Design a protein around this ligand. Structure first.
Ligand SMILES: Cc1cc(OCCN2CCOCC2)nn1-c1ccc2ccccc2c1
Ligand SMILES: Cc1cc(OCCN2CCOCC2)nn1-c1ccc2ccccc2c1
Ligand SMILES: Cc1cc(OCCN2CCOCC2)nn1-c1ccc2ccccc2c1
Ligand SMILES: [Au+]
Ligand SMILES: [Au+]
Ligand SMILES: [Au+]
Ligand SMILES: [Au+]
Ligand SMILES: [Au+]
Ligand SMILES: [Au+]
Lengths: 215, 216, 215
């Protein structure tokens, strides 16, 4: 039973950490909320999406100081995943939550990704075709609408040029990155984009850790 | 000098013994379905709502071929990510040599058709089907009622529109084809639940065919 | 610190080879130039792109004998990369330069690929949507226009049915093929297309080697 030691240790660790992370998520005080981010995005779903980004970042830094990256640590990073290609501006990211501005200037679409996190996107501009699993028809969502991609759900997404949205995700964030960079690894091979993503995520993690240390 | 190389010689011997075995089996096997049969059955219902067409096609298939089409309890729409496109399938029948399914997409997708060891026929029930054959510079658009025969060893570029639905029948060595149907699910989407669903429906169809053979 | 010798040697080798190849490319005598290919392509920017292909191949074989493959060694090879799919006709290829006719008859788009080479594409027909990195808006280019995808640059590309262009790339060509075949490896699994690409590249390399040997 010596060769079973590795497998038993792996099973024990994975189930001890499933239980640990699941109890942590059910007893942790979160910074942001899905209704909060969706409401803030709906407040500005009218004007030019750039002005919406500006006002949303201003209100976020006012209402949650020390939790949004500084303008020095902001950059649009490409995101290739599930067969679609867009760009993101990460405003906040922790081990359990993340907030970003996502969108595309080209017509793309693919797999939404099935991960251990609840994600909410409020469309600021463009169109969002969603095709839920097990169906034969898709629905199109317009600026002002908010789509909640639940945990374990998998849909087909499609966007139009100029489609932009504010996105908030809550769950176990690392387990999701495996999907967000798969195409960057096996399709685009844009390792510099991978580096940019890791860089901005590390900056958000260090910002959150510094804010925790100050308190 | 044959110790290093023993693995390579065993691999070559096995691959050629199994190419011979499989190609002799495919040339001496009585098949269940036919390309023209499925094409006619699909074209007969190409004018109705593709959902109603699906219903009537499943009924006629279970009527004319009892014991070879899955029961309604074992049917479910499984996402399919492959060649850069994304659609969904409903597997009606599948063995080691044949498969019948209802394929289509509710979003605008397109990519590589996939080159495999099987002849595949698709009859469009609704939507549009852009096909771009290899070595050409122009593409053709196929409409409901048309039937496309993707021959063995052929590779094309496919593109679909929202609401494109079709009945598809493939004949050949089915396992060697699944490698293409799940590549994006492995390296791009990582939707392992969809991988499990695919293995599930294929195993269910294989067990149904094995049970029908055992009863006979 | 004995096993740090391997890592230090690896870094030293990679930087000595970076310096070697980069100095070579900065001092090498090239056969073609981007303005030459771009002007020749713009002269024939029309609707009947096929006649443009024929006349361009004729002019290339006239002004540079022994550097363009013969009609026997020409074939349209599928190209899957970055999430898009097109087809190519390789006219010339070496270790530092390559000239081809690229295009698609279907609607595709994805990652342009970030490689160690400057690439120039002159659109003969169709439309070319380019989305530059770090921006939120995309530009649309039409037949006659020439786009220079610079070294280290990464953009999002999108094409329409019937989009065809003449492309010339200069740099370290092998390091680019890794991107050009990634989707063929992990997405399409079209090993025959991989063989065709390797075959036409080998034919071009042997043609250029024969021309060097004759001189
Ligand atoms: C986990 C993840 C999924 C994803 O997909 C694009 C967003 N939306 C998904 C659903 O609906 C359409 C668009 N991006 N992303 C990500 C990527 C990079 C990240 C970096 C730091 C923190 C979170 C980070 C999170
Ligand atoms: C082998 C294969 C190719 C494919 O591609 C989508 C269909 N068409 C292809 C050509 O034209 C456009 C659409 N699905 N598929 C498959 C996927 C899962 C399967 C599961 C069980 C049995 C056969 C199974 C077969
Ligand atoms: C390196 C590379 C990139 C590429 O991408 C498509 C062209 N364009 C790129 C930028 O803008 C849009 C379209 N093809 N390709 C290639 C593929 C095969 C090759 C074979 C031999 C020599 C060079 C060879 C070069
Ligand atoms: Au930004
Ligand atoms: Au931003
Ligand atoms: Au079904
Ligand atoms: Au069905
Ligand atoms: Au050619
Ligand atoms: Au050609």
């Amino acid at each position: 039973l010596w060769l079973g030691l590795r497998a038993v240790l792996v099973v024990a660790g994975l189930a001890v950490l499933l239980q640990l992370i699941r109890g942590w998520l059910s007893s942790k005080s979160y910074v942001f909320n899905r209704e909060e981010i969706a409401r803030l995005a709906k407040e500005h779903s009218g004007l030019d999406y750039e002005v919406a980004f500006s006002k949303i970042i201003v209100e976020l830094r006012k209402k949650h100081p020390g939790h949004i990256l500084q303008d020095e640590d902001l950059q649009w990073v490409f995101v290739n995943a599930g067969g679609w290609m867009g760009s993101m501006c990460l405003l906040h990211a922790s081990l359990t939550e993340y907030v970003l501005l996502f969108g595309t200037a080209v017509d793309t679409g693919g797999h939404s990704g099935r991960y251990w996190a609840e994600i909410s996107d409020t469309i600021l501009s463009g169109t969002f075709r969603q095709w839920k699993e097990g169906t034969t028809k898709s629905e199109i969502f317009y600026p002002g609408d908010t789509i909640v991609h639940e945990v374990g759900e998998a849909t087909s997404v499609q966007w139009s040029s100029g489609t932009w949205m504010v996105e908030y995700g809550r769950g176990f964030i690392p387990s999701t990155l495996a999907f967000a960079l798969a195409d960057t690894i096996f399709s685009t091979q844009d390792f510099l984009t991978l580096f940019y993503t890791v860089k901005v995520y590390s900056k958000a993690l260090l910002l959150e850790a510094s804010t925790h240390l100050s308190q």
